Every structure is written in structure tokens, then in C-alpha cells.
């Protein structure tokens, strides 16, 4: 029998193995993350999941915020409050800011940008190059609206992505459009007409300018007053170099070398200068914790950032069938870019306001449902909100390049486990 005055624990190997019930999906997944850190495959990660009710409030942190040893020769930890580079995860923030302007009657989603962005309206479309290497430019056909900006259907693209703009830079057209090693997201020309196709581009950088001009505030002040303050966030900024307290604790970016798969310190220009202006497509620094507050507020429809009906708009398929078709074709053909991150490489999608919408269940009742909204940031950051499942999740790394297979597999493992144990209905 038992020992007098002592809790009756396992007394032999039979009752000690049975004393521990078998490991569920989440515990097994945590082991995968720990092993990835231990085997040096990743520097670290933070994973977070929340429901609306409060019964799911899950945060786990693994590994280091850098590969550079600190003053004590140690590798400091990546924490839920570690300042990180959000890159394109900034786009959700800027989308919210635009939508607030709409709610306050400052802008209309279908008005042309000409009033507030005459500098964008006057910009030509790059069509090609002559034999001498001179750019061939033409007038835009049709007008860009704010809804085109929010849905990436304006005709704007990115210099690092579109072959026309790669050439444009090669020919030297953008050598004066940079300061502190950061290239202007406003200078490059469009590569198509608005409504012609879905093209990932500098749309939210322009939308951010629109917010600035509609409100008379710089995007930094607007951010602070309208997203940070209502959520009690004190560590979310475009101006990292003005926050000594965040600088002292920030993550470093890590890069995985293509040749050997080894992790190395990445001395990113974005961590040495903020730049002269706020680029709402890419420029915010914050912690995983503060980012989850944004996702969670949207999931709860608590009205702190936007009215519930405005949030609902963000989740509606915005593309007419022609564009929906072309986006899916482009994305299906481009697993090397993979905007959808952990999502299946072939999936019926649309675009909402703020990200990609799944138009079908990713794996029946095992994973994200139809109507879920998602996007990411360069350093393998992935976020999603799933209203049907009652969940939102974020996987935060500080590792480039985007679409790193190890991070993608871990992210899938994370979401799969959370859904398996905690999805409702």
C-alpha cells in the first residue's frame, strides 16, 4: 500500500509509466521546435494561438534572438516581448489604418487616388525597354482606387520581384531614389493598369501615404494613436532607432546561406536605419506579443480597432472571377515565392482587405477553414485569423529568406497541433 503521510505516486516502473499519460499533438510539436533549436536548424521562434473566449491563450518561445554572442559569450533568448522586424506583416496594420480613415469619412474605398496621391496618379506604366536600354513608358489606362491598393490590383509591383523593374534598376533609373541604403518604395513605375491583374507590390506604401495626407499626421503618430494606444501596446514603431530601450533588446536578423544551409548573422540595412519615411508595406518593428494583440482584437470583433462590420469586410473575397482566376494561377505556378507560406501549394484562394482568403477548407475539419485570412513577413513570419474555427495563430521567426522549408514545416506542425487539440466546431 502507500507510505503514511505521502502522496501515493508511482512506486515502480509500471505505475510511473502509467502515471504519465501519452503525449498529445501540442507536446510532440514543442519537441520538434526544441530539436530544431538544439540541432542548430533555426535560431529560434515564438508561436502563439488564441481563441475569442479566452480558453486558448498559448505562447511558447524557443531558442535565441540572434546567432551573435553577447557580452557574456551567450546567445540571448527570443521572447514574446522581443522587438522584431515585421516586414510585410506591417501590411495588416496599414490596412487597418486605411479602414479607420474610411470609417471616419476621410476616404472612400472606390474613390480614385488622384485627390490624395496625385504623385501616384501622374506616374507612368513601364512597358519595356528599347535596344539601347532606355525605358519605354506610357500613360496609365483607367484610374487607381484605394480598393486596388488594398487588394494589390493597382498595377504596382516590387523591384526585387518583377523582371521589368529588375531591369529598370539595372539600367540605373533608381540609383538616386535611395537614402541610408533603403530604396524608395514610391519612386518605381507601375508595370500594368489597375484591375488588369493581381501583382504583389508597393500598394501599402502608397496607402500609408494616403493615410498621412488624409489625416495630416505622419504614419508613426497615426499608428501610435489609433492602433497602439487602444490596445495598450508600447513597443510598436516605424522608428526603432529612436527607441534605445528596444534597440538594447532587439532580435538580429539571421540568414540561411543557400549553399550549405548554415545560419549566419544578417547585417540588414533595415536594422541600422529607419529611413526618412514610413513605408506601410514593410516598416514596423514590434514584438510577437503586441502583434498577437492586433490579431486577437480582430478575432474578438471587440471594436477597439474597427467596427465589427468593417472587420467582416476584410474577410470578403474582393476579386471578380477574372482576377481570382489569374491570382490562383500565378500563385499555383510560383511555389518559389509562396505568398501563402504553410498553406497547401495548390489551393483555391482569393484576396480580401489585409491578406489572402482561403475559399476552401485546407484539410477538411483538421486545419484552417474556408474564410480564413492570412499573410506574412519576410523573416518567415506567418499570421492567420480563422473566424469559423474561432482561432488566430502566429508563427514568428527572424530568419530569411522567406519560405524557408524548415520554418514552413515547423509552422505547419504548430498549426496542425493547435487545431487538433483546440479547434472548436
In the bound complex, what is the minimum distance in angstroms from residue 159's beta carbon to ligand LVA?
7
Mark 247-286 with x for binding to ligand LVA (rule: CB under 6 A) and - for no binding: ----------------------------------xx----
Which one of 110-118, 237-245, 376-384, 413-421 is the stretch in contact with ligand LVA (CB under 6 A)? 376-384
Residue 242, classified by CB atoms within 10 Å of its CB into exposed (0-12), middle (13-18) or buried (19+), is exposed
Is 87 or 123 the residue whose CB approaches ligand LVA more closely? 87
* Radius of gyration of the chain measured on its C-alpha atoms: 23
Is 188 or 195 the residue whose CB approaches ligand LVA more closely? 188
Binds ligand LVA (CB under 6 A): choice among 87, 191, 223, 410: 87
Helix or strand or coil: residue 189?
A: coil
Residue 90 grid cell: 506591417
Binds ligand LVA (CB under 6 A): choice among 291, 402, 419, 422: 402
CB 396 within 8 A of CB 381: yes
Binds ligand LVA (CB under 6 A): choice among 17, 160, 248, 259: 160
Is 32 or 161 the residue whose CB approaches ligand LVA more closely? 161
Q: Does 124 bind ligand LVA (CB under 6 A)?
A: no
Is 128 or 335 the residue whose CB approaches ligand LVA more closely? 335
Residue 330 grid cell: 500565378
Which one of 29-37, 101-109, 300-308, 397-405 is the stretch in contact with ligand LVA (CB under 6 A)? 397-405
Binds ligand LVA (CB under 6 A): choice among 189, 288, 342, 376: 376
Is 133 or 181 the residue whose CB approaches ligand LVA more closely? 181
In the bound complex, what is the minimum distance in angstroms from residue 286's beta carbon to ligand LVA?
14
Long-range contacts of 59-64 (CB under 8 A, 24+ apart): 59/288, 59/289, 59/292, 60/30, 60/33, 62/33, 62/34, 62/36, 62/37, 63/36, 63/37, 64/37
C-alpha 141/C-alpha 139 separation (Å) is: 7
Binds ligand LVA (CB under 6 A): choice among 212, 400, 404, 415: 400
Mark 328-357 with x for binding to ligand LVA (rule: CB under 6 A) and - for no binding: ---------x-x------------------
C-alpha 267/C-alpha 281 separation (Å) is: 21
Number of C-beta neighbours around residue 130 at 10 A? 8
CB 157 within 8 A of CB 165: yes
Which one of 132-140, 164-172, 322-330, 395-403 is the stretch in contact with ligand LVA (CB under 6 A)? 395-403
C-alpha 172/C-alpha 223 separation (Å) is: 34
Write out the DSSP string of 295-360. Answer: HHHHHHT-SSSS-HHHHHHHTS--S-HHHHHHHHHHHHT-TTT-TTTTS-SS--EEE-SSSEEESS
Q: Which residues contact 57 (CB under 8 A, 6 or more apart)?
A: 50
CB 314 within 8 A of CB 95: yes
In the bound complex, what is the minimum distance in angstroms from residue 136's beta carbon to ligand LVA?
24
Mark 184-223 with x for binding to ligand LVA (rule: CB under 6 A) and - for no binding: ----------------x-----------------------
In the bound complex, what is the minimum distance in angstroms from residue 282's beta carbon to ligand LVA?
4
In the complex, which residues of this chain contact ligand LVA (CB under 6 A)?
87-88, 160-161, 200, 281-282, 337, 339, 375-378, 400-402
Amino acid at each position: 500500500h502507500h507510505s503514511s503521510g505521502l502522496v501515493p505516486r508511482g512506486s515502480h516502473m509500471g505505475s510511473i509509466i502509467d502515471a504519465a499519460a501519452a503525449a498529445g499533438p501540442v507536446v510532440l510539436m514543442e519537441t520538434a521546435f526544441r530539436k530544431a533549436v538544439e540541432s542548430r536548424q533555426i535560431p529560434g521562434a515564438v508561436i502563439m494561438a488564441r481563441d475569442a473566449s479566452g480558453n486558448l491563450n498559448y505562447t511558447r518561445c524557443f531558442g535565441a534572438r540572434t546567432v551573435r554572442r553577447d557580452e557574456n559569450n551567450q546567445l540571448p533568448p527570443l521572447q514574446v516581448d522581443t522587438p522584431c522586424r515585421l516586414a510585410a506583416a506591417t501590411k495588416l496594420l496599414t490596412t487597418i489604418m486605411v479602414l479607420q480613415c474610411m470609417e471616419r469619412g476621410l476616404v472612400d474605398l472606390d474613390e480614385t487616388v488622384d485627390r490624395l496621391l496625385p504623385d501616384l496618379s501622374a506616374m507612368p506604366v513601364l512597358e519595356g525597354f528599347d535596344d539601347a536600354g532606355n525605358a519605354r513608358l506610357r500613360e496609365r489606362r483607367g484610374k487607381i482606387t484605394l480598393r486596388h491598393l488594398l487588394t494589390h490590383t493597382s498595377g504596382l509591383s516590387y523591384v526585387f520581384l518583377h523582371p521589368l523593374l529588375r531591369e529598370y534598376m539595372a539600367q540605373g533609373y533608381l540609383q538616386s531614389a535611395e537614402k541610408f541604403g533603403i530604396q524608395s518604395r514610391l519612386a518605381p513605375p507601375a508595370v500594368n493598369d489597375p484591375g488588369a491583374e493581381w501583382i504583389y507590390g508597393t500598394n501599402l506604401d502608397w496607402a500609408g501615404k494616403l493615410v498621412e495626407r488624409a489625416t495630416g499626421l505622419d504614419l508613426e503618430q497615426y499608428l501610435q494613436e489609433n492602433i497602439c494606444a487602444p490596445l495598450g501596446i508600447t513597443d510598436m514603431t516605424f522608428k526603432l532607432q529612436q527607441r534605445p530601450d528596444m534597440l538594447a533588446r532587439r532580435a538580429d536578423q539571421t540568414h540561411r546561406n543557400s549553399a550549405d544551409g548554415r545560419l549566419r548573422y544578417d547585417d540588414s540595412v533595415y536594422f541600422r536605419a529607419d529611413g526618412e519615411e514610413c513605408f506601410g508595406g514593410q516598416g514596423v518593428f514590434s514584438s510577437p506579443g503586441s502583434y498577437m494583440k492586433v490579431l486577437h482584437s480582430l478575432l474578438k470583433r471587440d471594436g477597439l480597432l474597427l467596427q465589427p462590420q468593417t472587420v467582416d469586410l476584410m474577410f470578403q473575397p474582393a476579386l471578380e472571377p477574372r482576377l481570382e482566376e489569374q491570382m490562383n494561377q500565378h500563385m499555383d505556378a510560383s511555389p518559389h515565392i509562396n505568398y501563402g507560406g504553410p498553406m497547401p501549394m495548390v489551393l483555391r484562394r482569393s484576396f480580401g482587405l489585409g491578406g489572402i482568403i482561403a475559399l476552401e477548407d485546407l484539410d477538411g475539419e483538421n486545419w484552417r477553414r474556408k474564410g480564413s485570412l492570412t499573410f506574412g513577413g519576410g523573416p518567415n513570419i506567418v499570421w492567420q485569423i480563422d473566424p469559423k474555427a474561432g482561432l488566430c495563430t502566429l508563427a514568428f521567426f527572424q530568419l530569411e529568406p522567406w519560405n524557408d522549408p524548415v520554418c514552413r514545416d515547423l509552422t505547419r506542425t504548430f498549426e496542425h497541433a493547435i487545431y487538433a487539440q483546440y479547434q472548436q466546431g
